[PDB]
């Protein structure tokens, strides 16, 4: 449910910032940090 899915995009931003750091992910990421709850 969104909680589990609040905790999955910290996380995989986590993955993003250490290694999955390509620009494409700072799209959904732009779109992550917003309260789009």
């Keep these: ?3 589990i899915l609040s ?9 993003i910032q250490k290694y999955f ?8 990421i732009r779109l992550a940090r917003i309260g789009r709850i």
Aim: net charge neutral; no cysteine.
């Design 21 to 28: 750091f390509s620009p494409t992910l700072f799209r959904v």
């Design 1 to 3: 449910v969104v909680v």
């Design 7 to 15: 905790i999955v995009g910290t996380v995989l931003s986590d993955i």
